[PDB]
Symmetry: D2
Subunit: 115 residues, 4 copies
């Protein structure tokens, strides 16, 4: 599993469950093409977005719908979404774990890249 | 000053100086219209992006060129950039300070919204 | 001002106001000798803790009373406090700004060290 | 497993391996008593510190030796250590995952508490 995302809620100290996200890949003509999508599970994780074969070199964008997450909890948050944009697999295949830590007016994002 | 950005470098323990960024407003056709840009000062701050009259309600994106910053320092970064996307002034004009804390494989962004 | 602390609230998107903290210096017997304290202003900042003459090399601890802050806001926190422990002035006097970003179940602390 | 710690390196985008930490519990007389210790594995995780039976209610402190971690990589970091202090099990037994994200001049810590 070459691309996984984990989302935590910094207010409750819990996984952020049922958070929707879409992944995009930059095409040769510079547009963002839809690549994969999913929502976080009860553990705050989203697995199975792609395969080693499909996940070729390129620039990818993960757009995490954090606004809908907060709104369903009654909160009007600052950010519309949390976006993570990165070049992947430039030196060969790697495994990427993207973590997002959510607060109503702040988010943090971290990448763990393994070989 | 309705919109200010402050950037810190978590590797060196300093303001992040000469960080370039662009501010976009979302157009009617859902494309991003650039409208302001600048680079952070010796204090890591960028002021004077817009004015209260011009800074009307809408969705705004700040794209911070973190990759160029880390490249200029000889340090390999993960992200292409750090984006902050938010709806402004939904309850009337506010002063926004966007605070970004940068590491090569992680960043955080926080909004301090004052009235 | 050799030592300043700035605290932000990631839930409300604001300076964290009236946050109490104590500064300790490590004694010869490895106990913590209190020597300064204060509470953050309307801007979330605490200035005037020490002076350049008094702020000699040594190990210092800032204990930020985050639990009281969250309790005063009616929000359940995880931590008893946020501690920052550091050796000061190891290469000669520096100006230290300690920046703390607070959420109920997460915090970050960053040092901006200028010369 | 009621108490686990995970440590990541924000510079390299990797688990922080072989990071030492000590856990303490506040005694009835207010002193910190040694509770458990260990070092992070190749995955940046430390498991098996305690048991459900042993991990009674109380105030606990995790002192993570982040300075030694950075020094072994050639870096003189800001913090002496990263300390996480918290009341545990106040409403019955819970499972605690403490995460720490390390940069030379910044650290973040998060708690995920599950029932």
């Amino acid at each position: 599993c070459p691309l996984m995302v984990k989302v935590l809620d910094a207010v409750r100290g819990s996984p952020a469950i049922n958070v929707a996200m879409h992944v995009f890949r930059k095409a040769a003509d510079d547009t963002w093409e839809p690549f994969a999508s999913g929502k976080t599970s009860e553990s705050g994780e989203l697995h199975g977005l792609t395969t080693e074969e499909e996940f070729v070199e390129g620039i990818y964008k993960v757009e995490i719908d954090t606004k809908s997450y907060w709104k369903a909890l009654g909160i009007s948050p600052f950010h519309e979404h949390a976006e993570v944009v990165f070049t992947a697999n430039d030196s060969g295949p790697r495994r990427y774990t993207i973590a997002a830590l959510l607060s109503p007016y702040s988010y943090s994002t971290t990448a763990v890249v393994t070989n």
